[PDB]
Each structure stands twice: as structure tokens, then as C-alpha cells.
Design a protein around this ligand. Structure first.
Ligand SMILES: Nc1ncnc2c1ncn2[C@@H]1O[C@H](COP(=O)(O)OP(=O)(O)O)[C@@H](O)[C@H]1O
Ligand SMILES: Nc1ncnc2c1ncn2[C@@H]1O[C@H](COP(=O)(O)OP(=O)(O)O)[C@@H](O)[C@H]1O
Ligand SMILES: [Mg+2]
Ligand SMILES: [Mg+2]
Lengths: 101, 304, 220, 304, 220
């Protein structure tokens, strides 16, 4: 039971770090999604081809923004899955401690 | 002396006419392919015209101006600001989009269902749309500056309002479509008649023998009518298939183009109504051409 | 009668006149030879009777119904009653004999089984039942002529017209073809044979002979 | 035995064949109209393609090379890289855009009057552009790519036909061109064949007697060759007239559109050199189709 | 000689044999009748001679040159030497008589003046010079047959072949046509007439008679 306690502390620290990362990434994703909502640029509403602009450069900006969004969501899913798995294992460890007790 | 039922003779004639196409493979196949292509091209032109018309109608909005409030702004504050803006003169109308309505609009797009669910509480800024009373660009700029300085907003977005250019492009496309469609319809109508004339000339001996016997004119005429109808039906079906195979490629190309920007677009294909009208037009054209050509060439054949 | 003329005369566009005041009467069951010279009006008469060309002067009565100005829409019904045999034995080489003989019936849109039985009966009557499924190319000349006669007579015509049916056959087969026509006449089918062969007509004097000479018909 | 010379017989045959078309005015006029329309379709399509290509070339033909620096590179290293690029040859003219400037450009593009907030200063990476000092496009591009790779630049987006790309121009345009060319070839190569087959059929007895007497095959064939050549030539002339009429029709519509944009433009008809190519194509197709179809159909006609 | 056969025989695709071991020889200037029955091989013989259909067993010599396997490119040159007359008097109804008779010359691309003089001579010889500018429709049957003979003989053929030229004419005109053929033979043109009319051949026994019976040629 004593050994499990140290593992419990390590799991708690990992969970705290994961929660901090989740909050940070949630804020980042929220702001990025809001920026996309602002800069939709839908074609069917005649929002394309702004006059007298570097179309290639603006397209590159949009593509980079979309790629960053995809990477951010992928990382968020990865970290959330890892945190959920650790929490499930941590809860099981507590259940195992109950059996020992 | 028993006679077959009225429908039975017509069905037998139709089956015989369909079977007749196998007599001469090369000519029939080539004419059918040309008919299919000439009926497919106007379909694609009309499809492009309809897409352009739909886009132009969508762009018909009178340069509506969008206003974004701060995400943390209280709901009663937003309501008060909307009421004040409505009270203010030079504003035709005010439309308020709630944060969750905007969230639904954003979720309509692909790839956003997962992120919204993953986020604990998605919070889009309250987007408000104000339609200027005067369409003048100077007035639009002045109103945008005033709204930005109103001290209750975070950003302001304005539209392009390029109605004239799209109207001119639509007019040009309409003229081109009408001209090319007329040319193709005339070409396909005339091509059928020539093949029917050649077929009639091919079996001169049989027609002479039948007219020498007391055969009626309608009996001689029916097989050519049904051959023309089969030509029309097969051509129209092939044209519809080609139109589908072309619209898939065009949709792919337009999606690739719009992918350069983060937004996406899809083409509106021809509806279920259009296909039926296309088949009807093909059948009507084929039957009329076959009837006129065959009858005119048949009047000039004597039994002896 | 089966056909009657009243001072009928035909004048061609060129100005040459094939027929001039020709008048004869046919009673049902009779047979005639309609002899003529190299010119005369034999072919023109056979064309007039079946309404291929209209007359100019007189009137024509088929069964008491005027055929002088028959509307063009009623010609097929008239022709359905008349069977025609030609020297050329017009046959569709592409199709089979059973198809050639069955064309008059199929024109009326008759059921397949009745067509089969009637065509078999006609071919057996003319002695060509065995070769009902062969092409006309394989048949010899006499067989082709007999097939033509069968095709002409399949539809129970009231009047049968022959236009020098024995042009392309030697006298040996001429006798057989004439005997076949005689049998058909015995069956009760009116016939008006047309030939310029004086020997053949002189062979059998039973049937009334009409001589056509430079557009005039002596009827003796 | 006196015999006509080589050229006299050919000239007589040409004149006689041309005169023969008036025996059946309607049959030989409908085929001419069909050929004219079928050949004018691709001509008008090519005319529009040439006009739009000329417009695209006319609008602007400068040369500029853009290089995108990696986001990882920090701000101080930007000045060092700028100095290094300036020092190296062929890099005389250089412009640098700060990430804030890029954000301002993006905000302007979307229609915002002022830079959009809640995007931070790390939205976009820094971008540099280098003018082409060396006229050698290939060598300059290779040198720029090598330099960018050496410096670790994530991407090197040299100016090129991004719009053309490998999606629209690579596939859709080629497919449309191939389809139109195939339609032109089949429609012309088909109706010419059928008309000559019908003409040969109408002269069955004459051809039989001619073969029986001992006429050579070439003598039988030549009149139809010349008839097909005349068909092709007249069809090409009619197609040229039709394209000219179409240009006259579209002049006003194009003028209305061109006026609105800065570039004043006028429709240009087919060049006088192009007309010769059109006529050559018409006569070539006519002659080839006539020869092939007439010979094939004339094989199966025995003297008796 | 003008033509010679060496055990030539023809077998049709169906399996019926028109000719079996037929052998005869013609010397320049002679005339023959080639009598046969309704079947036999008269028409097949006339088709073989002018190379319309090739033989199977033997060999054919025209003027010492083998015609058994003549290449298809040389057939027109051979046919230019042979004139052919048919029972149907094949004529182009659209064109004029002067055009119909002038076709063999125009095929060779001869100058217009020589064509005119030669055609006038031929039409005068056949007695149709007066109606040289009329259409064949207006002419009577005998005139049409004479026009056909003139068209056949215009090009000075070495051998003239007639395929029952008197099928569609009564004996009165048969005599005239036969006398015209006799005159042409006197001129020095070899002829091989073909007919099944025993009376006509028996009328004039001067010319050697070849009887064709079921594909066998007795030559007596
Ligand atoms: N289509 C026509 N136009 C002018 N005359 C014609 C026409 N057909 C036939 N004739 C003439 O009218 C007369 C009728 O001759 P016809 O009865 O046909 O002789 P046959 O019985 O031997 O066939 C003949 O002198 C013939 O030349
Ligand atoms: N195309 C053909 N195919 C098969 N057999 C044929 C063909 N033409 C003719 N025959 C047969 O070959 C034989 C030759 O007959 P033919 O010489 O043509 O008679 P005629 O001299 O009276 O015209 C006949 O038995 C005929 O039926
Ligand atoms: Mg007659
Ligand atoms: Mg014969």
C-alpha cells in the first residue's frame, strides 16, 4: 500500500500538469476558432478575391492558420486521451488499494 | 382473320426498331455518340449558367455590414446596444445572432464538430448585422467608423458589394449559353434526319414491294418513328451520364480551388426535374426529326 | 361485275396515247388472256386496273364502286383485294421464302399462328412447302416464279392480275405455270392473264380472248 | 485516239461535281449547315480562349520571387538574414514584411477597417521577397531555392501560375479540349460519310452500268472525292462567317464588361493566317471522309 | 481463237453446279446461238465469259491470254473489248439517248468531237439517229432495245455477247433484232447469241448451234 501512495502522488502531479495543459490548449483553440469565425471568407456569398491584394500571400496565411488549427486540435485530443487513460488507471489503483486495505 | 391489339403492334414495332440498330454498327454507334455529346454540352452550359445565377442572387444582399461585440460583454448590454443602434437613424435594420446560433453556423462546416465538443464551453462573440440605409460606399465607410468608435464593439467587417461585375458576367454567360445551345440543338436535330433518310433509301425494294401490296402509309412509317425515338432516348441517357461525369470533375476542381483558402464550396448539380426534361427534349427532337425526314423522303417513292 | 370500263382512255404527258375508248366487262370466275403486240396497252391496262395510274376520259368500276377518282388514302384497301404477278418475280433476296410469302398477311397485322398455317397451305398448294425456310437465291427460276404466284395469291384476292408471268421461262415451264393458273381459276379466283405469246393463247381456246391493238380492244 | 490531258479531266470533274449539288438543294444544304455549325463551335471556343489568354497576359507581366521564413527563427536573426541576403549578388532589391504588417494585411483582406484583435502577434510567420536580378528565370529560381534551403526557410513560394495549378488547367481544360475536338472530328467525319453513301446509293444503276462497260475504279471514285472536297470547303467558309457573326453579337456584351474594369478591351476576330488553317482543315476532313466512306460503300456494289 | 475453254466448270456456294466440263472454241467472225433449257448454264456462261464470276476447274483463254486468274485490276481492260446486251435493256432513264450511247466512249475520256461523230454513225447504223436527243422514256420497247444494241456496239468490240436480247419483244420485232445482229456479224464482229427459243434458232441453220443441257455442252 505504501508503494501505491507514491504512484498516487505521481499520478496526481501528472493530472495537474495535464489539466493546466488542457486549459492552455482550450484557450488557444477557442481564440483560433474565433479568429476563423471572423475570417471565414465563404465563396458562395461573394467574399472571395478582395480587390488589390497579394492573393498568393493571403492564401498562404490562411493555409498556415488552418494547419496550425489542425495540429492544435490533434495535440489536444492526444493529451486529453492520455489524461483520461491516466485518470482511469489512477482510479483503478485506488480501487486496488481498497482491496489491499 | 384476327388482328393484334392496338398496343401489341406498337410494342412489337418498338422492339423490332430497337433490334434494327444492330444491322449497321459503325454508323449507328457514331451517330448515337455524336447525339449524346451534342446533348451533353448544352446541359453543362446550362449547369454553369444556373450556378452563376445562384451566386449572383446570393450576392444580391445590399452590402450588409457586420458588427462583432466583445465575447465577455453582458447579454443585457448587448440587448441595450442593439436597441440603441435600431433607434439610431441611418440604420435600416438590426439582426442579432446569438453566440450559440453562430456556433451552429460554424459547426455546419466540416471538421468543426470534433473541436466544439472537445471544448468545454465554446464561446463565439456576439455577431450583429446592421444594414446601412444608403448604399453609398462613402456612407458605408462613415457608418463603419462611427460603429467602431461607438465604444461597444471589438471589430467591424464589411462586404465587397461587387454586384455590377457579376451581373455583366452573368449576362455574357447567358448569351454564350443561348448561342451554343441553339447551335447544338440544330446540329443534333439535323444529324438524325440524315440517318433516317439513308435508312429509308437503304430498303427501297422492300418499301416498293409493300406499297405494291395494299400496305398503308402508317405501317411503313412506324418503324422509322420508333428508330428515331430510340436514338433520342439513348442519346439523352448518354448525355445525362456525361453531364454527371463532368459535374463531378468540375466540383472536384472548384473544391481544389477553394481549398487554397480555408473555406470550401460545392457545386449545385442539375436537379431531378432537369433530367426528366432532358429526356423529354431528346425524345421529342428525335421523333419529330425522324417523322419529318422519313415522311418527306417516303412521299417520293413509287411502287413501279 | 368484277371490273368494268366505260370509254376509259389514257394519254401520257408526252402526247402518246396508250389506250383509246377501251370497254370490256368481266364476270366473276371468268379468265381472259388480253393478247397484244409489242406496243399496245397490256402493261398500261394492268397498271390502270390496280390504280397505280389514274385514267383521263372514262370511269372504272370494281364492284359497283367508282375507281375513277378514288382518294389516295383508299388505294391500299383496294390493292389488298387484287393480287399482282410480274414477269420479274419481284422477291426480297435478303429474307426467306416463308417471309416473302407471309408479307401480305403481316401487312394486315395478323396473328403469327394463322399466318403460319395459311402460308403453309399456300406453299403446299404451289408445291414449295419443302423449301419454305430457304433463301430465294438457291431456288431456280421456275421455283421463284411459283413462289411469286403463292405470295400473290396468299391473301385470297378477288381478282388476280398477271403481267406476262412466263417471260423468263421456256415453254416447258410455261405449260406448268399456265396449269397452275388454271387450277387457281377452278378454285374460284378470277384471273386476267396478259401475254403477247400467240401460241400459248391459241393452245387453250376455252377462255375468252381479248386482243389489244394500238390502244383499241376488239374483244374478239 | 485523242485523249484529254491529266488536268483537263480533273477540272471538268470538279466543275461538274460542283454543278451537281444543285440537283438536290435541300439534302446538300442541310449537310453543309451541319458541317458549318459543327466546325464553328470549336472555332468560337478557341476565339474565347485566345481572348481570355490575351487579357490575362496583358494585365501584368512582372517578375517577383517570394521566400517564407520559418516560424522558429527569432526576430533578431531576421536582421542578420536580411543583411546576408543583401550582401549576396542577385539580391539587390529586397523587401521585408513584419508579422504585424502581415496581420494588418490579413485584416484588410477580410474587410476589417482596423486590425482584428484576439489574434495575438504570432498569427503569421515573417515573409521576405526578393526581386529577380538575373533575367534567367530557371537559374534565378534554382539559386533562390538553394539559398532558402541553406537558411532553413520552410517554404519558397516563387511566383508562378498558381491559378493554373495541376487541378483545373492540367485536367479539366485538356479534357474539354479533347472532347470538343472529338465532337468536331466525328460530326464532320460522320455526316459527310452518310451523305456520300446516300449519293452512291442513288446512283446504283449508273455505277453498275459503268462498271460493266469496263470503267476503272478511279474514274468511278473521283466525282465523289470532289463532291466531298467541295462540301468541306463550303463548310469551312460558312463556319468562318458564323464565327464572325458570333463575334459581332458578343462585341457589345464584352464592351460592357471591359469598360467596368480598368483594362479597356475589344474582341479580336480570327487572324487572316488562321482562316487558311481553317480552310485547310475543312478540305482535308472532307476529302479523307469522302474517300474512306465512298470506297467502303462502293466495294459492295456488283455490276449485276 | 476469240475464246476457248479447257474443261471449265463452275460450282456455286450452295453446292449446285451450273457448268460441268464444258469445252467449245470460237473462230473470229463466227456466230453461235447457245441454246438451252429453262435451267442449264446460258446466263452463267455469259457471266463467266466477261469475267464477272471466276471459274473453278478449268482455264479460259480470250486471245491466247489466260483469263482464269486475271487480276482484278485488269478486268476493266478486258471488258472494254466485250460488248454485252441484256434482256432488260439497262438504260439510264435520267440521261438522254445520245448520253446513254456515248457512255462507253466517255469512260475512256475521248475528245468530244470524235464522240459526237462516232455516236452519230452508230445511231444512224441502228436507225435511231433522228431521236438522238430524246429521253429513253418516250421510246417504245423495240427502240429501247436498238438503243441498247447501239450502246453495246459503239466501242468496236471484238466479241459481242447477247443474253436473250429478245425476251420482251414479240416475234415480229424478234426478226428485226436478229437481222440487225446478222448485219453486225457481216460487218466482222464476232457474236455469241444466247436464247432458249427453239423456233428462232431453227429458223436460221447457217450458224453453228451449241445446245447446253444441265451444264453439259453437246456442241451439235
Ligand atoms: N411513262 C411513259 N410516258 C410516256 N409514254 C409511255 C410511258 N410508258 C409507256 N408509254 C407508252 O405508252 C404505250 C403503252 O405501251 P405498253 O402497254 O406499256 O406496252 P407493253 O404492254 O408491251 O409493256 C407505249 O407506246 C409506250 O411507249
Ligand atoms: N447466285 C447463285 N447461287 C447459287 N446458285 C445459283 C446462283 N445463280 C444461279 N444459280 C443456279 O445455277 C444454275 C445456272 O442457271 P442459269 O444458267 O442462270 O439459268 P438461265 O440461263 O436460264 O438464266 C441454275 O440451276 C441456277 O438456279
Ligand atoms: Mg409490258
Ligand atoms: Mg438467264
Amino acid at each position: 500500500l505504501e508503494n501505491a501512495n507514491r504512484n498516487i502522488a505521481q499520478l496526481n502531479s501528472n493530472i495537474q500538469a495535464l489539466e493546466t495543459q488542457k486549459q492552455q490548449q482550450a484557450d488557444k483553440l477557442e481564440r483560433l476558432l474565433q479568429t476563423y469565425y471572423l475570417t471565414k471568407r465563404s465563396l458562395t456569398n461573394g467574399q472571395f478575391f478582395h480587390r488589390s491584394a497579394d492573393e498568393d500571400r493571403i492564401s498562404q496565411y490562411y493555409q498556415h492558420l488552418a494547419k496550425s488549427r489542425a495540429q492544435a486540435i490533434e495535440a489536444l485530443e492526444k493529451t486529453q486521451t492520455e489524461l483520461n487513460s491516466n485518470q482511469k488507471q489512477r482510479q483503478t489503483e485506488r480501487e486496488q488499494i481498497e482491496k489491499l486495505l | 382473320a384476327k388482328t393484334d391489339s392496338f398496343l401489341a403492334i406498337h410494342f412489337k414495332q418498338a422492339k423490332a426498331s430497337f433490334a434494327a440498330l444492330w444491322r449497321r454498327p459503325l454508323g449507328n454507334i457514331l451517330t448515337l455518340a455524336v447525339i449524346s455529346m451534342a446533348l451533353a454540352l448544352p446541359a453543362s452550359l446550362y449547369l454553369l449558367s444556373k450556378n452563376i445565377a445562384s451566386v449572383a442572387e446570393r450576392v444580391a444582399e445590399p452590402s450588409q455590414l457586420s458588427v462583432y461585440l466583445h465575447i465577455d460583454t453582458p447579454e443585457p448590454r448587448i440587448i441595450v446596444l442593439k436597441d440603441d443602434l435600431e433607434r439610431r437613424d441611418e440604420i435600416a435594420k438590426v439582426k442579432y445572432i446569438s453566440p450559440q446560433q453562430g456556433l451552429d453556423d460554424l459547426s455546419q462546416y466540416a471538421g468543426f464538430e470534433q473541436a466544439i465538443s472537445l471544448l468545454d464551453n465554446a464561446t463565439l462573440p456576439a455577431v450583429l448585422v446592421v444594414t446601412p440605409k444608403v448604399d453609398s460606399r462613402e456612407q458605408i465607410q462613415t457608418l463603419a467608423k462611427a460603429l467602431q468608435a461607438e465604444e461597444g464593439v471589438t471589430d467591424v467587417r464589411m462586404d465587397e458589394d461587387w454586384f455590377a461585375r457579376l451581373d455583366a458576367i452573368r449576362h455574357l454567360a447567358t448569351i454564350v449559353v443561348i448561342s451554343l445551345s441553339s447551335l447544338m440543338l440544330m446540329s443534333v436535330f439535323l444529324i438524325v434526319g440524315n440517318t433516317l433518310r439513308f435508312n429509308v433509301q437503304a430498303n427501297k425494294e422492300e418499301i416498293q414491294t409493300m406499297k405494291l401490296i395494299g400496305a398503308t402509309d402508317a405501317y411503313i412509317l412506324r418503324p422509322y418513328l420508333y428508330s428515331g425515338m430510340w436514338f433520342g432516348l439513348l442519346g439523352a441517357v448518354a448525355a445525362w451520364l456525361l453531364t454527371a461525369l463532368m459535374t463531378i470533375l468540375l466540383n472536384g476542381a472548384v473544391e481544389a480551388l477553394a481549398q487554397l483558402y480555408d473555406s470550401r464550396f460545392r457545386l449545385i448539380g442539375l436537379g431531378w426535374d432537369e433530367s426528366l426534361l432532358l429526356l423529354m427534349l431528346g425524345v421529342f427532337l428525335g421523333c419529330v426529326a425522324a417523322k419529318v425526314s422519313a415522311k418527306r423522303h417516303l412521299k417520293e417513292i413509287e411502287p413501279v | 361485275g368484277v371490273i368494268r370500263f366505260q370509254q376509259v382512255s389514257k394519254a401520257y404527258r408526252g402526247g402518246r396515247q396508250a389506250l383509246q375508248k377501251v370497254d370490256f366487262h368481266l364476270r366473276r370466275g371468268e379468265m381472259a388472256f388480253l393478247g397484244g403486240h409489242s406496243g399496245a396497252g397490256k402493261s398500261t391496262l394492268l397498271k390502270l386496273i390496280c390504280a397505280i395510274e389514274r385514267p383521263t376520259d372514262g370511269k372504272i368500276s370494281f364492284n359497283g364502286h367508282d375507281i375513277t377518282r378514288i382518294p389516295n388514302k383508299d388505294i391500299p384497301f383496294l390493292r389488298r383485294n387484287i393480287g399482282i404477278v410480274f414477269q420479274d418475280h419481284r422477291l426480297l433476296m435478303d429474307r426467306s421464302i416463308y417471309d416473302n410469302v407471309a408479307l401480305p398477311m403481316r401487312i394486315e397485322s395478323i396473328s403469327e399462328n394463322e399466318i403460319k398455317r395459311r402460308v403453309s397451305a399456300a406453299l403446299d398448294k404451289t408445291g414449295l412447302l419443302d423449301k419454305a425456310r430457304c433463301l430465294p437465291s438457291q431456288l431456280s427460276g421456275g421455283e421463284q416464279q411459283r413462289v411469286g404466284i403463292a405470295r400473290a395469291v396468299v391473301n385470297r384476292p378477288t381478282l388476280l392480275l398477271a403481267d406476262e408471268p412466263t417471260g423468263n421461262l421456256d415453254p416447258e415451264l410455261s405449260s406448268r405455270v399456265l396449269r397452275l393458273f388454271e387450277e387457281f381459276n377452278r378454285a374460284g379466283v378470277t384471273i386476267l392473264l396478259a401475254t403477247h405469246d400467240i401460241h400459248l393463247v391459241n393452245s387453250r381456246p376455252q377462255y375468252r380472248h381479248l386482243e389489244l391493238n394500238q390502244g383499241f380492244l376488239s374483244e374478239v
